[PDB]
Design a protein around this ligand. Structure first.
Ligand SMILES: *[C@@](C)(CO)[C@](*)(O)[C@H](Cc1ccccc1)NC(=O)[C@H](Cc1ccc(OC)cc1)NC(=O)[C@H](C)NC(=O)C1=CC2=CCC=CC2=C1C
Ligand SMILES: [Mg+2]
Ligand SMILES: [Mg+2]
Lengths: 231, 195, 211, 235, 233, 244, 240, 222
């Protein structure tokens, strides 16, 4: 109300409204799902178009051979943050000959987002990210919020109508975690999960976007007729 | 570059400057004009290290031309020469000094007098009836000391200048490929096409 | 190296050798010492190979941007000056670059000599490199403004040959260019080994050499 | 007052949303992509008859294989074009090749959100970036001041955009020829323009693989206008 | 640009079937003066890596602190610091190699020659060299300073190529290293009798031996040597 | 943050005026009147000190008339402290020009420089403008005797006769009435004092409430002399012109 | 440094500071530009509220940027000096780096770029100035006339006016200026420029300034008597 | 005084075939008269069917390769996984080298691969960034030993058709991969004999449309 003019101002109840408004931009964004087993990790994203003449906005970005994310909210802010991750993943390789741990990647994103919430002049990031990866401790899935909060999960979803997919994963928890050494069945579970967040529209060939990473699988993105198999 | 001469007569200033440009052991050009018009009644000849000469001259030219447009007025030769000196005196203590010696010949329209200024790369300014830079003065000053009068005509000034160039051509080891002569008077700047 | 270029009635000729040295060692028999900046602009190379390539390929970037902003092709005078200005920033830092900027523009054909010192000279004829003195001898005695294109191409070709023979750090092959108002025209790669013997027989020159 | 980089309660940047309103006031620009090329066309909209219309430059060359049309506060576009041209030629310097249309568009869009308290406000102009490369062929992009860019088969921006976009919805198909696309841009421009369309108050351009980016002459466009009138009178 | 003041001499090492061995004497010389007799130039990093350093001791102490701080920093927000995400020899080496090359590029080098010896997660042997110039190389045997000239020849008689590594036991390899250290004591004027030796095995882990001495030395034949040619008495 | 407390000194009004410049001019309108009159053989500068006291040391006082160099002087209207900042800058510019070109600075060039500084404070920096208006009286060999004025907007204009400060409307009418082109310095002196005498808010115009100066070629042969009038000399010229 | 964003968008998509800068231009004295077949003329109003002025030394309204290009303006006087200075520096800078004088189109594009930069830079306000830039390109006999404004947009004009009551004189020019046949001579061009100003000026005495620019750096300013003869002839034809 | 440069010896060799290319180099690393390693790889697969070797000062060579590999990575990120053509890689490397025009990478660099028409390609560089496409090129310590041999046995220089009185040249052909590898091995065997910094081992990387293949051969260890 009087305490939402900038990010440097607490409300009387201890809330940061500019951060909460940035969180709102994620809810307006298109749905995206993340889930993992012990061997693989999967991202599934519903892409959005402007109209019938337009293309479908890309949702998934590669950060390294073993790491990448999907976005929901302001796409330019995802480009800034993913670029930062690319550099940090790269610094780890060039200096330490070491693939960046997914947990440490989350810690770096948290600390970058936080600086924007405590300083005058700047603004919070207006995007939520789902980071998947495979490192020395196996498969991982992270959820990033622009408040700074990063959370390691078995599965999750963010964006509009994401609550439906999140409930499904909460029921299926015991099933999909056990899908080891079978990438196609893990993607199926992800496609079935994101389907719980659909209304009116359904999954078409240029609508759906899928990404996967695993034990002997580099981070690869599937679009177009490559995902027709899963429709 | 090599030889630049200057002589102030009754009603004009005459500047002579060599035409040669040498890279290594080869003479690349024998028709080079070592001069820039700073204003309609002010001419500056120059000589020194390769590159620095033209860069400095063109930089001075741009500054004087900027002043002329801003004030809609031509600076006096004295004022221009002082500006040039300051730029060189500023330059000599720089990281990399500009290694350029100049002669400034101008006609002051206010005083109706020709004026010749000699300035070296250190920023050493002197007003003279006749001047030169480098080794040119060693050969020519004895002739000028003998033959120069202040009431000389432009034609007499050119004849005395021919005698100086002839002496240079006889006693200098270097072939400077003759000179381009330019006259500065009340009517402005013109080039003597046959010399 | 040995490069040359000269203006004449039907445009400008540009000829270069193709040798590259690393002391006494001939590191390359066939390098390209001419850069096509645009269909109406050429650039010769003499001195440090890296400097010549970098700065003239950077000149091409800048001449390209001129065309886009002004909707008009850059002049030879302006192009040469941009290059000389670049050299003056790295003045004293140790660059080694001698080049001719050849082309055709609104004022007709144009030819400018530019070097690492920031020197920029307009002229009808130039020659740069370790073997330029040999090339000048042939050029000065045979040059006319009234030359035919066929004779002019031969003159530049023959002038490089003269230098390639005598100068130890020049040779390999001869590259020819002819610049018209419709643009420049490449006129082949000519091996000096084969060209020497051909010229010796047809012209009768190089009597001193046995063949 | 309030921050320049402030979020609204709905989760949008106030300034970005306000810049979009300025673009709605701008003159109409239309782009249509085909397999034979991409066509770009604009409304010139001279404020007075004494204004020499040929000086109105709302269609612009970025590279030989990339063109650009603008709508909104057109003065803001000059630095965007300058950056685009520099990016296109700089990539050619570093990689000895033409730059991808998408990569060029992305480079332009990276400027968009560089505002705060960098420049003091977002750009007040939208761009239609059309081009061709070997990988993805003939492409048309719509670059906004939000930093977002969408690829389009056909797109209209400016004051008559939503009316034109509905028309482009019905008319566009994947087998359009270049000649058909030219007439289609002219048809839709004539529909949304206030004044009567002619060769002096409207401008056409295209990008083909062979000839590259070309702005059409007033004599060439005049014939395409006359060809349009006759084919509409044909039924 | 500087000059080294207090220096440490040769560091020698080699691979064997199950791991690596590394050794270095405990001397800190001040030119020709044998000033400091209790200097440890082998520095363990965790239980899987040993860094052996020769050259300037003040720069060695600086590196020793960078490594100590590297372990501290790795444990930060890392539940698997003593397991999967522990420091590896290849991580430690590349860090140093990055620092060494950066310092030489600023014309302010760390005046050292370093050998990183260790065993990786998968049981693979790691042995790589880096110096003040940022120059890196790997080999079945590695040595710095005088060791390069005298020790490597002896150690390469045991492991001449890669295929000789599985055939070499720890007893044979240690014996070869200890013999090499004796040879260096005979012939290196800036060496000492006292030295340290470290073994990193993939089964038995890190064994760090201190206060070792060169023994079984041959000197008796000196009594018979008289004069420099013609002298008999 | 800090934005909350920013007055924004460098913005346009909806009507296209600069708020702070307009308000600064309002400030200047309450300042003591200063008059400049240019004649064929010299220039006069007259100015009124503001409600003084008997205990003010007048002979060592200077609030209105300042010397920029030997050829150029200024009359001040507005904040004295602001004016001194600018005056010292102008004195330095004149000496920089002299050092560079070895010639005394032309009057207009000095005026333009100060006016450009004032302009800067209206377009960038977020600082308040200088609440000062100058009358420049000077001589150079190009244009001869010159009068200029500058105000907080940074705009400057040339004049034959001009007033700044209080009652300029009334003062400018009186000058426009009695001024003629063939006028001389002694006549201009009389006009300046008569104009102040009629426009003053004080009951009577006395020597202790005035600062006065002339720039004359009335110096021995082709050269220019600046005369800052002393208290006793102002008292004499008041009797001579018949005001007291 | 002072970084405050003064020029910003409003809910309706307007930048008020840029629009309020146009109001300052509306307040400024009238300026007019007319190009003939072989010349361009720049006319300027001088408000007669200021008498006792010294016209020798008072800043003239038309400014030379180079020997072949001129610039007149309407709006804040102090602001115009900054643009003119920058333009003059760029003109010499272009001659120095490219060895050709600026084209009128290039100089205009630069000045317009400066104006634009001041609409999206922190801590600064837009220039309260619109300019008319006229001249002839080097070795070209085609006349050039351009206009700029605070937003940074620019365009070429057969004839144009800016400043106070510019709406009225533009109305006059639109009906009086024929494109198919522009003022063939200098006389006809000046006459049309004076006529247009007489619609707005008040008295035709010292209120009208005229500056004729011809090809090949031939620029002259008319005197009071020369202009007064045009004023006399126009009204004598009008009495009919 | 501190000398930031050094000489790690070694020699490299690149040959372009009709539809293939090879990049070979010895595996010996040295300082002065000492051997550091008998097997220290010098030729690398940099991705996108491109191979690279920087010969001279190992620390500067490792740094350059490391940077180019990184340049390839960022080319994919920035340009939608587009394949970096061999000609584009060459130009990119010129700019990497000239970055240090005033503190050079003391290395002679060669890259090999296939052009966009599928033909074999080799590019050579000097330490400050001058580059050129070549058919044949040896670089490093024994470059002067090998290059004349390749002029003779690859481009058939000074070789004529017998009975033509030297009037007809030997016609130029392309060589098979099997024929090229023979010339590579004989080149290094010869260089090993007369150059002290060359020996120990020889590693060849062959590039075809099918990918990048390796071959290793022993050399004399003295
Ligand atoms: C003619 C052959 C005279 O030598 C002619 O000028 C050619 C011109 C040319 C060649 C190739 C492309 C364009 C133009 N000049 C050369 O071949 C040139 C001569 C030259 C050699 C060396 C230096 O500085 C050391 C300056 C000029 N040769 C080179 O540029 C060769 C390729 N450069 C080197 O071999 C070289 C070795 C080296 C080691 C460390 C740092 C730099 C080094 C360079 C440039
Ligand atoms: Mg002197
Ligand atoms: Mg040996």
């Amino acid at each position: 109300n009087n305490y939402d003019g900038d990010t440097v101002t607490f409300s009387p109840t201890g809330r940061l409204f500019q951060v909460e408004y940035a969180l709102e931009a994620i809810k307006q964004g298109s749905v995206t799902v993340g889930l993992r087993s012990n061997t693989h990790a999967v991202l599934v994203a519903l892409k959005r178009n402007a109209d019938e003449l337009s293309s479908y906005q890309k949702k998934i970005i590669k950060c390294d051979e073993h790491m990448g994310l999907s976005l929901a909210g302001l796409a330019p802010d995802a480009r800034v943050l993913s670029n930062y991750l690319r550099q940090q993943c790269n610094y780890s390789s060039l200096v330490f000959n070491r693939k960046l741990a997914v947990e440490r990647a989350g810690h770096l994103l948290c600390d970058k987002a936080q600086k924007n919430t405590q300083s005058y002049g700047g603004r919070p990031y207006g995007v939520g990210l789902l980071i998947i990866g495979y490192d020395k401790s196996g498969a991982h899935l992270l959820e990033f919020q622009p408040s700074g909060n990063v959370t390691e999960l078995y599965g999750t979803a963010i964006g509009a109508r994401s609550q439906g997919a999140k409930t499904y994963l909460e029921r299926t928890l015991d099933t999909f975690i056990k899908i080891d050494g079978n990438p196609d069945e893990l993607i199926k579970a992800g496609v079935e999960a994101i389907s719980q967040s659909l209304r009116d529209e359904s999954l078409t060939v240029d609508n759906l976007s899928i990404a996967i990473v695993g034990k002997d699988t580099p981070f690869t993105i599937y679009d177009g007729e490559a995902v027709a198999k899963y429709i | 570059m090599d030889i630049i001469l200057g002589i102030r007569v009754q009603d004009s200033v005459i500047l002579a400057s060599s035409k040669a440009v040498t890279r290594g052991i080869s003479v690349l050009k024998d028709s080079d004009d070592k001069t820039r018009q700073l204003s309609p009644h002010t001419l500056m000849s120059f000589a020194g290290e390769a590159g620095d000469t033209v860069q400095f001259a063109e930089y001075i030219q741009a500054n004087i031309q900027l002043y002329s447009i801003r004030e809609d007025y031509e600076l006096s030769p004295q004022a221009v020469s002082s500006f040039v000196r300051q730029e060189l005196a500023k330059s000599i203590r720089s990281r990399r000094p500009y290694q350029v010696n100049v002669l400034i010949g101008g006609y002051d329209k206010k005083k109706n007098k020709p004026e010749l200024y000699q300035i070296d790369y250190l920023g050493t300014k002197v007003e003279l009836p006749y001047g030169a830079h480098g080794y040119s003065g060693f050969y020519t000053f004895s002739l000028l000391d003998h033959h120069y009068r202040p009431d000389m005509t432009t034609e007499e000034g050119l004849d005395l200048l021919k005698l100086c160039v002839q002496e240079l051509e006889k006693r200098m080891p270097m072939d400077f490929k003759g000179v381009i002569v330019k006259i500065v008077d009340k009517d402005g700047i013109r080039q003597v096409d046959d010399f | 190296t040995t490069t040359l270029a000269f203006k004449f009635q039907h445009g400008v000729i540009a000829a270069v050798d193709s040798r590259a040295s690393a002391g006494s060692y001939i590191s390359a028999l066939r390098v390209n010492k001419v850069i096509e900046i645009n269909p109406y602009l050429l650039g010769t190379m003499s001195g440090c190979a890296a400097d010549c390539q970098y700065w003239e390929r950077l000149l091409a970037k800048e001449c390209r941007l001129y065309y886009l902003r002004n909707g008009e092709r850059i002049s030879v005078s302006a192009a040469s000056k941009l290059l000389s200005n670049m050299m003056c920033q790295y003045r004293g830092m140790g660059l080694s670059m001698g080049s001719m900027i050849c082309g055709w523009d609104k004022k007709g054909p144009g030819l400018y000599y530019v070097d690492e010192h920031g020197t920029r000279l307009s002229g009808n004829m130039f020659s740069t490199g370790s073997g330029n003195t040999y090339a000048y001898g042939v050029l000065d005695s045979n040059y006319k403004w009234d030359l035919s294109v066929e004779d002019a191409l031969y003159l530049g070709k023959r002038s490089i040959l003269a230098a390639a023979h005598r100068d130890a750090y020049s040779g390999g092959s001869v590259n020819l260019y002819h610049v018209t108002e419709d643009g420049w025209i490449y006129h082949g790669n000519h091996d000096v080994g084969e060209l020497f013997w051909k010229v010796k027989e047809e012209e009768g020159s190089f009597n001193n050499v046995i063949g | 007052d309030r921050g320049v980089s402030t979020f609204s309660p709905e989760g949008r940047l106030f300034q970005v949303e306000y810049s979009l309103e300025a673009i709605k006031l701008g003159s109409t620009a239309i782009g249509i992509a085909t397999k034979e090329g991409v066509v770009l066309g604009v409304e010139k909209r001279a404020t007075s008859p004494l204004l020499e219309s040929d000086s109105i430059e709302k269609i612009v060359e970025i590279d030989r294989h990339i063109g650009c049309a603008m709508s909104g506060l057109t003065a803001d576009a000059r630095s965007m074009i300058e950056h685009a041209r520099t990016a296109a030629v700089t990539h050619n310097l570093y990689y000895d090749e033409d730059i991808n249309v998408e990569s060029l568009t992305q480079s332009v869009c990276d400027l968009a959100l560089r505002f705060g308290e960098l420049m003091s406000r977002p750009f007040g102009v939208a761009l239609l970036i059309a081009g061709h490369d070997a990988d993805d062929g003939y492409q048309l992009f719509h670059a906004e001041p939000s930093g977002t860019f969408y690829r389009y088969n056909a797109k209209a921006i400016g004051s008559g955009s939503e009316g034109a976009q509905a028309e482009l919805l019905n008319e566009w198909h994947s087998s359009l020829t270049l000649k058909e696309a030219e007439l289609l841009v002219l048809k839709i421009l004539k529909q949304v323009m206030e004044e009567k369309l002619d060769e002096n108050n409207a401008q056409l351009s295209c990008i083909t693989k062979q000839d590259g980016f070309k702005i059409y002459d007033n004599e060439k466009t005049a014939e395409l206008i006359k060809e349009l009138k006759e084919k509409e009178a044909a039924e | 640009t500087q000059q080294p003041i207090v220096t440490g001499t040769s560091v020698i090492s080699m691979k064997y079937d199950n791991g690596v061995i590394i050794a270095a004497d405990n001397l800190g010389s001040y030119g020709s003066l044998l000033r400091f007799n209790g200097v440890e130039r082998l520095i363990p990093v965790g239980d899987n890596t040993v860094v052996g350093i020769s050259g300037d001791i003040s720069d060695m102490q600086h590196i020793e602190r960078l490594l100590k701080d590297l372990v501290t920093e790795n444990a930060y927000d890392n539940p698997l610091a003593d397991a999967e995400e522990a420091l590896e020899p290849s991580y430690i080496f590349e860090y140093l190699a990055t620092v060494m090359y950066q310092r030489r590029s600023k014309m302010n080098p760390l005046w050292n020659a370093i050998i990183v010896a260790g065993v990786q997660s998968n049981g693979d042997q790691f042995l790589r060299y880096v110096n003040l110039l940022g120059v890196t190389y790997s080999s079945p045997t590695l040595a710095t300073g005088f060791g390069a000239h005298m020790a490597n020849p002896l150690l390469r008689k045991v492991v001449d190529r890669e295929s000789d590594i599985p055939k070499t036991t720890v007893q044979v390899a240690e014996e070869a290293i200890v013999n090499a250290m004796r040879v260096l004591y005979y012939r290196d004027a800036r060496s000492s009798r006292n030295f340290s030796l470290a073994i990193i095995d993939k089964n038995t882990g890190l064994t760090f031996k201190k206060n070792l001495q060169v023994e079984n030395m041959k000197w008796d034949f000196a009594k018979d040597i008289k004069g420099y040619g013609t002298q008999k008495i | 943050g800090s934005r909350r407390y920013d007055s924004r000194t460098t913005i346009f009004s909806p009507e296209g005026r600069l708020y702070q410049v307009e308000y600064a001019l309002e400030s200047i309108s309450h300042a003591g009147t200063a008059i400049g009159i240019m004649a064929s053989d010299g220039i006069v500068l007259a100015a009124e000190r503001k409600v003084t006291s008997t205990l003010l040391e007048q002979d060592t006082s200077t609030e209105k008339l300042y010397k920029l160099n030997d050829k150029i002087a200024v009359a001040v209207a507005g904040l004295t402290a602001d004016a001194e900042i600018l005056i010292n800058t102008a004195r330095i510019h004149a000496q920089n020009y002299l050092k560079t070109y070895n010639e005394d600075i032309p009057v207009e060039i000095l005026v333009r420089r100060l006016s450009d500084i004032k302009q800067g404070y209206t377009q960038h920096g977020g600082l308040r403008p200088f609440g000062v208006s100058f009358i420049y009286a000077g001589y150079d060999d190009r244009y001869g005797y010159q009068l200029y004025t500058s105000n907080p907007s940074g705009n400057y204009t040339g004049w034959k006769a001009i007033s700044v400060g209080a009652n300029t409307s009334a003062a400018q009418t009186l000058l426009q009435m009695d001024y003629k082109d063939d006028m001389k310095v002694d006549d201009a002196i009389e006009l300046a004092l008569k104009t102040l005498s009629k426009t003053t808010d004080s009951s009577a115009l006395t020597y202790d409430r005035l600062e006065f100066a002339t720039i004359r070629k009335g110096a021995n042969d082709g050269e220019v002399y600046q005369k800052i009038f002393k208290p006793q000399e102002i008292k004499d010229i008041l009797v001579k012109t018949g005001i007291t | 440094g002072y970084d405050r964003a003064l020029s910003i968008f409003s809910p309706d998509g307007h930048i008020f500071q840029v629009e309020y800068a146009l109001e300052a231009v509306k307040r400024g004295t009238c300026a007019v530009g007319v190009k003939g077949k072989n010349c361009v003329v720049l006319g300027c109003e001088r408000r007669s509220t200021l008498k006792l002025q010294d016209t020798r030394i008072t800043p003239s309204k038309v400014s030379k940027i180079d020997s072949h290009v001129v610039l007149s303006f309407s709006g804040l006087n102090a602001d115009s000096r900054i643009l003119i200075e920058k333009a003059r520096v760029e003109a010499q800078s272009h001659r120095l780096t490219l060895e050709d004088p600026v084209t009128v189109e290039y100089l205009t594009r630069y000045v317009a770029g400066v104006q634009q930069r001041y609409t999206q830079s922190g801590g600064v306000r837009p220039f309260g100035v619109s300019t008319l830039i006229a001249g002839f390109d080097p070795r070209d006999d085609e006349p050039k006339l351009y206009q700029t404004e605070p937003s940074g947009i620019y365009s070429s004009w057969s004839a144009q006016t800016i400043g106070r009551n510019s709406k009225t004189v533009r109305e006059f020019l639109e009906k009086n200026y024929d494109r198919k046949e522009p003022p063939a001579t200098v006389e006809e061009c000046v006459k049309l420029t004076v006529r247009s100003l007489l619609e707005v000026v008040q008295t035709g005495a010292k209120n009208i300034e005229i500056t004729v620019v011809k090809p090949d750096s031939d620029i002259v300013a008319l005197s009071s008597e020369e202009i007064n003869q045009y004023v006399t002839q126009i009204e004598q034809e009008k009495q009919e | 005084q501190f000398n930031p440069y050094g000489d790690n010896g070694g020699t490299i060799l690149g040959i372009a075939g009709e539809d293939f290319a090879v990049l070979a180099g010895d595996t010996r690393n040295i300082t002065d008269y000492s051997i550091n390693s008998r097997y220290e790889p010098k030729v690398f697969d940099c991705g996108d069917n491109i191979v690279m070797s920087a010969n001279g000062f190992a620390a500067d060579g490792d740094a350059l390769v490391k940077r180019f590999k990184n340049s390839v990575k960022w080319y994919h990120f920035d340009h939608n996984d587009k394949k970096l053509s061999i000609n584009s890689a060459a130009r990119n490397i010129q700019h990497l080298l000239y970055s240090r025009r005033f503190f050079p990478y003391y290395v002679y660099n060669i890259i090999a691969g296939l052009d966009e028409d599928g033909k074999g390609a080799v590019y050579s560089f000097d330490p400050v960034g001058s580059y050129q496409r070549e058919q044949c090129r040896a670089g490093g310590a024994a470059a002067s030993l090998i290059m004349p041999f390749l002029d003779n046995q690859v481009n058939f220089k000074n070789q004529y058709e017998p009975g033509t009185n030297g009037k007809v040249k030997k016609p130029l052909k392309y060589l098979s991969v099997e024929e090229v590898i023979k010339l590579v091995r004989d080149s290094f065997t010869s260089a090993t004999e007369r150059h002290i910094q060359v020996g120990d081992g020889l590693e060849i990387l062959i590039v075809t449309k099918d990918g990048v293949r390796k071959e290793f051969y022993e050399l004399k260890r003295d």
